[PDB]
Amino acid sequence: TIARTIVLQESIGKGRFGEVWRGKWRGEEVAVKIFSSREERSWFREAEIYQTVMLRHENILGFIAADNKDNGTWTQLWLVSDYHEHGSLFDYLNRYTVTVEGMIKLALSTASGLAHLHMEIVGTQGKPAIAHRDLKSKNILVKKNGTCCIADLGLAVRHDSATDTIDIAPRVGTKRYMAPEVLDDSINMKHFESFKRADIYAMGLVFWEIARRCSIGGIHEDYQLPYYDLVPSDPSVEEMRKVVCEQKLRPNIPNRWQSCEALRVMAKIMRECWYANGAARLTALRIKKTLSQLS
Ligand SMILES: NC(=O)c1ccc(-c2nc(-c3ccccn3)c(-c3ccc4c(c3)OCO4)[nH]2)cc1
């Protein structure tokens, strides 16, 4: 009664695996991600993460269902979610500039989603702490109300806090957004907090992307991906490692950002997400608090 009743209308892009469509379910727009039979492990793992108890949150993509659909020749494996017409934060930031208010809304909601992912909720209906492992502007979506929600949870890892163990055996993710310790393979992958810290580094890069598009008095920067000035469009681990680990460079913080308090606060958050030492980085909770006070 899920897949059977949905009609696909428009192809809207690709996932890591799977094809994303705009579909209609009981007259409503939904997003459908479709995987083939040979991608069952990917589909199942993403279904599993989205079905985590107590996961739902305004800043996490709203999951509707996992399902199968047999068309008479082959079986499709479906994930169905809320639909957000703006699409990704990447798309949004390319299309638009934002106000100071708009920037803070995007950054705060992103941090709130990540803080929720990262947080263990204790109790009978307890939520394990979860780290994303591939956070970037392309997998954060922008809702009609101008807030963000986090998607693409297929690479996520979940923590059992009593044993300090992780639910799968984990260099995944997008090379451009990989933390220094991921790039140089020094990350201790038996340590769950290390994955949280790596997510924070990537969120700092996303905040830089947003801040570039904050237009004050007609003044703003063009849209760029982090490290656009230092690496090729599809960089290798080695190309990223030489920049981030060896030369110790980070995205440049424009001078015009010091002239505005909101932009100063954002720039300071970025610096404190970009430390080479993960243990020194801000937590998502702390970032949320700081942006909430700013909002
Ligand atoms: N570049 C990446 O690594 C990447 C980027 C994006 C995805 C992705 N997944 C979905 C999605 C997920 C579950 C169910 C439906 N769609 C969606 C999705 C969900 C809702 C949407 C959408 C895309 O566009 C309009 O509303 N995007 C996956 C991987």
Instruction: Give the number of domains in the chain.
Output: 2
Q: What is the CATH number of the domain that holds 207?
A: 1.10.510.10
Please check if 154 is assigned to a binding site: no
Q: What angle do CA 222, 149, 138 make, to 5 degrees?
A: 45
> Do residue 9 and residue 141 come from a single domain?
no
Q: How far apart are CA 32 and CA 20, in angstroms?
A: 6
- Asked if 220 and 283 sit in the same domain, the reply is yes
CA distance 193 to 207: 21
Tell me the CA–centroid distance for residue 69 and ligand 1, in Å.
19
Structure tokens at 52: 């985590």
Q: How far does Cα 258 stand from its chain's mean position? A: 27
Q: Are residues 192 and 243 in the same domain?
A: yes
CA atoms lying within 13 Å on the CB side of residue 17: 19
Instruction: Say yes or no: 73 and 118 in one domain.
Output: no
Cα 195–chain centre separation:
13
CB distance 260 to 99 below 8 Å = no
Technique behind the model: X-ray
- Are 193 and 186 in contact by the 8 Å Cβ rule? The answer is no
Where a domain ends, among 37, 54, 85? Answer: 85
Among protein residues, the one with the nearest Cα to ligand 1's atom 29 is 15
Q: How far is the CA of 151 from the centre of ligand 1 (A)?
A: 6
Domain of residue 45: give its range.
1-85
Residues 144 and 287 in one domain: yes
Query: How many angstroms is it from 89 CA to the middle of ligand 1?
Result: 11
Distance CA 213, CA 219 (A): 9
Rg (CA), the chain: 19
DSSP β-ladder status, 75-82 and 28-35? antiparallel
69 and 194 share one domain: no
The answer on 99 and 37 residing in a single domain is: no
Map tokens 């984990």 to a residue.
170
- Interatomic CA distance for residues 238 and 71, integer angstroms: 44
Q: Do 14 and 102 sit in the same domain of this protein?
A: no
Secondary structure, 3-state, the chain: CCHHHEEEEEEEEECCCCEEEEEEECCEEEEEEEECHHHHHHHHHHHHHHCCCCCCCCCECCEEEEEEEECCCCEEEEEEEECCCCCEHHHHHHHCCECHHHHHHHHHHHHHHHHHHHCCECCCCCECCEECCCCCHHHEEECCCCCEEECCCCCCEEEECCCCEECCCCCCCCHHHCCHHHHCCCCCCCCHHHHHHHHHHHHHHHHHHHHHCECECCECCCCCCCCCCCCCCCCCHHHHHHHHHHCCCCCCCCHHHHHCHHHHHHHHHHHHHCCCCHHHCCCHHHHHHHHHHHC
13 and 129 together in one domain: no
Give phi and psi for 19, each to the nearest 5. Answer: -115, 135
The CATH number that applies at residue 60 is 3.30.200.20
Nearest CA to ligand 1 atom 3: 16
Same structural domain, 172 and 125? yes
Q: Quote the distance between the C-alpha of residue 285 and its chain's center.
A: 16
Residues having CB closer than 6 A to ligand 1 are 12, 15-16, 20, 31-33, 61, 79, 81, 83-84, 87, 138-139, 141, 151-152
User: What number of other Cβ atoms are within 10 A of residue 68's Cβ?
Assistant: 14
Dihedral, 232, 284, 126, 61 alpha carbons, nearest 10: -50
Identify whether residues 155 and 256 lie together within a single domain. yes
For ligand 1, atom 21, the nearest C-alpha belongs to: 83
Atom from ligand 1 closest to the CA of residue 64: 14
Domain ends where: 85, 118, 149? Answer: 85
Phi then psi dihedrals of residue 208, to 5 deg:
-60, -45
Whether residue 77 sits in one domain with residue 110: no
Residue 56 assigned ligand-binding role: no
Final residue before a domain boundary, out of 85, 110, 137: 85
